[PDB]
């Protein structure tokens, strides 16, 4: 239930993970600043080795679609 425990499985498709992430966070009780920061922080930090590598590589300015396409696979 905690957004903090939303973690991507080794074989779990990225888009599956981001889906679980987005839906936990929307129902999460927090301010808007925090949610941005959780999005900017946890999403990358909780991803699997490879998707973490690919995301950190794109940068904080990366867009969700950029992230989707790169991790598609």
């Amino acid at each position: 239930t905690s957004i903090l425990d939303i973690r991507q499985g080794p074989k779990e498709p990225f888009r599956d993970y981001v889906d679980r992430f987005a839906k936990t966070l929307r129902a999460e009780q927090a301010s808007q600043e925090v949610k941005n920061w959780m999005t900017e922080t946890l999403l990358v930090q909780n991803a699997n080795p490879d998707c973490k590598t690919i995301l950190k590589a794109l940068g904080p300015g990366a867009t969700l679609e950029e992230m989707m396409t790169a991790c598609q696979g």
């Binding site: 992430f21 987005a22 966070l25 929307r26 941005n36 999005t39 900017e40 990366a62 969700l64």
Partner: peptide, 12 residues
């Protein structure tokens, strides 16, 4: 991305 990026894609 930002929280706003997740709301546009997955919704509120």
């Amino acid at each position: 991305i930002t929280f706003e990026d997740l709301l546009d894609y997955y919704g509120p």
